[PDB]
Structures are given as C-alpha cells and as structure tokens.
C-alpha cells in the first residue's frame, strides 16, 4: 500500500515539519500533498530533493531511530533554544522534530565532533541542515565564533560548509536561510559532524531497504 501524507510533501514529512501528524514500514509509492512552504517552513534550499524523492519512492523496510539523543549528545551546546515562529505548533514556537538547531551555550560555541557508525543491517538516511544568519550580529548571538565552519564526512560523502551571512528577501518573516542536506550510510560506515557553528544536527535518522 502507498504512503498517504495528509498535508505535507516529502520534505515536510521527512524533516519532521510540525504540521505533519501520525506508522508505515513499507510503501509502494508516496502520495505527497502539496504545501506553500515547499515543506521547508524555515526558508532554505533543499539540496538534491528530487534525488531523495526518487529513492524514497519504494522501500520495503523503514525504521526511525534516535541517531543522536537530544538529552545526551549535545552537552557543551544548547539544544533547547532552537525554535522559530516560522515553524510553529499549538500557538508557540517549534522546529523540525527530526533535527535540532544547536546554539552556543554561554558565550562560546566549542568545536563540535560527533560520529555515528551504522550498526544496522541496512542503509541509514541522515538529514542535517546549515543555517545562514542575515547579519553577522545574528551569527555571534547564535554561534559566538565568526569564523565558523561545518564538516560532514563519511566514506562516500565529504563537504565543508561555510556560513553565508546575507540579507535575503523576507520569506516567512525570516531573511536568514537554512539549507538541507542528506546522504546514505552503508551498513558498515561512519558519518561524522564537525562544527564551530551554523549546524542543525540530526536527531532522528531512518534505516531503510529499498526496491527498484
């Protein structure tokens, strides 16, 4: 049986947009209900979205697990400030439930280093984001360090992201941007996240087995 997303697209349901609600462990194809925000209730480009749609179309197994527990994986940073009026819920501010927007604890964003090794018996889909403040004043209020960077690397993926501080058009009340990235982890591989700021870490991943 297919996947009937009620009021979200793929990007809305996979990122954990707070508007999506309600358990599928297999689906032939996806029924994506459109939305204005394009799934991204926080403005930003989704890198290789069609590539991820195409490989989410037909899966035979689909487990969702907490790759990085919120209450224990981020001790030197603040994992509780990352909510926005752009992604609301129940009247208050919220955020994607499968990501965590990390922010400096105190007045310091110490270098972040976290690794996950695929202990599963199938591929693991990992989603993260890169935030770009509108002004450098926001950068220091969020990440303390002005020369921040993000490094994401596995055995088949490697990229260094740099903050792109620019005043963009006011979309969804926000002139900052937040790009979204993904990659698949082979059953024996390790993915690593290095950051001195601007990283929206994964909180939930997905272990899946696809068809054709």
């Amino acid at each position, epitope marked *: 049986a297919p996947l009937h997303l009620g009021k979200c697209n793929i990007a809305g349901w996979i990122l954990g947009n707070p508007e999506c609600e309600s358990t599928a462990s297999s689906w032939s194809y996806i029924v994506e209900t459109p939305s204005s925000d394009n799934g991204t209730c926080y403005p930003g480009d989704f890198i290789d979205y069609e590539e991820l749609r195409e490989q989410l179309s037909s899966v035979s197994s689909f487990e969702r697990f907490e790759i990085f527990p919120k209450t224990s994986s981020w001790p030197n940073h603040d994992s509780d400030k990352g909510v926005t009026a752009a992604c609301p819920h*129940a009247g208050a501010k919220s955020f994607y439930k499968n990501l965590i927007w990390l922010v400096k604890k105190g007045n310091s964003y110490p270098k972040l280093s976290k690794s996950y090794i695929n202990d599963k018996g199938k591929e693991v889909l990992v989603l993260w984001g890169i935030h770009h403040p509108s002004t450098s004043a*926001d950068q220091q209020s969020l990440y303390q360090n002005a020369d921040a960077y993000v490094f994401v690397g596995s055995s088949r993926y490697s990229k260094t992201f740099k903050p792109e501080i620019a005043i963009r058009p006011k979309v969804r009340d*926000r002139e900052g941007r937040m790009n979204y990235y993904w990659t698949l982890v082979e059953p024996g591989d390790k993915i690593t996240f290095e950051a001195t700021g601007n990283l929206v870490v994964p909180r939930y991943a997905f272990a899946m087995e696809r068809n054709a």
Partner: antibody
Amino acid sequence: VQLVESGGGLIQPGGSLRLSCEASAFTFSSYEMNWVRQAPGKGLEWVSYITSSGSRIYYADSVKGRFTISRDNAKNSLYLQMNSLRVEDTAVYYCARLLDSIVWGEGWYYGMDV
Amino acid sequence: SYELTQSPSVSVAPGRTARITCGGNDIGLKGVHWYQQKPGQAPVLVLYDNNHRPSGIPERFSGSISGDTATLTVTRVEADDGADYFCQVWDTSSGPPHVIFGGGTKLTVLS
C-alpha cells in the same frame, strides 16, 4: 548581581533630569539594557531599550523625541536623559537587563533578569 | 497598537492552583514573559519565552501557550505568592520594535 539607580526627584514641567543605572557583579558590556516605568499606582510601561554595542536604540511612542538612551560601558552605567517632562511622566523608573541579548533576525526575545 | 489583554484580579485559597492568563494575537510566536511584583518591590522575572523558568524560581511556576492565550500557573499557592503579575512580549509586527505589557493580575491569596 545588582543595579543601582538614582538621579530622580522633583522636576517642574518642561524641565529635565538625567537618571543613571550603575552595574555591579556582572559584565555590563555584554548585556542589553532597558528602562521601564510605573505610574504612582498603575502598571508597567516600557520606556526604551539599547543593545550592548549601543547600536540599536528603540523608544516607546509616548517618549520619542523627548527621552534619550545612552550608556557608558566604560563606567558600567546606563542613562536616561529626560527632556520636556510632563505631568504624566511622573512614575517610578526601573532599569533592567535582558537574560540573553535579543536575536532580532531570528525573532528570539528573552525576559528582563535583574 | 498591539494590546495584551489580562484579567485584573484572581482570588485563590491557600494550597490551591491559580492560573493567570494573558491574551494576545500570536502570543506564543513572540514569546511571553511573566513578572512578579510584590507591593513596594521591584518586578521579579518568573518565566521567559512562554515556558522557560529562570533560576531560583520554584518549579511551582509554569507556563503554557494555548494559541492566542498564554497562562502562568502557580501550584500550592501561599501567602508569599500574593503579588501583581504582568505579562510581556516584544512586537516588531506593528511598527518599530516596541515592548507591550499587560494590565497586570493581582493575585489575592485569601489567607
């Protein structure tokens, strides 16, 4: 942590005074400051606000063009220059600091700590 | 021009729960902050950003956002808790950045 204010008293209408708000036991240069008044028996009313850098300075409508915010981080003191005072300006004037600085582009506001 | 509506008086008995409400258009998206002012004393921040509780504030103080209505909840209410409570938001969607308070809710403890 403590904020000591003074400089207030009795002014005749059209007159002026300067309030001061000195800081102790915290790094006054990294916190964003505020002035809030309270009529003799009424409620709280925000007067004005300034960042730690002295960059952003906002005022309430009823005091624009009459009150000016200033701060000297070199002396841990915040100022309110009140010109063209009126009878409805009679109130208790509090200074207060925000927990964490306001994240404007992200819409993050924190309360007033001390 | 934006207005935070707030009830003026609430009366509770010793030991019960008192709920002070603060109404405003999109109050949760802005972040509502609560202050406790005792007679003759300066205000005391008891809640910021809707739910977050400052240090030294007892866990008896909590906050919820039910859409356009914010609520300060005080459990095991005692005579020391009797004071005036004000809510606060920042508003950038009604002109220049300006701060708005509520009228204040006097909590009488009936002790």
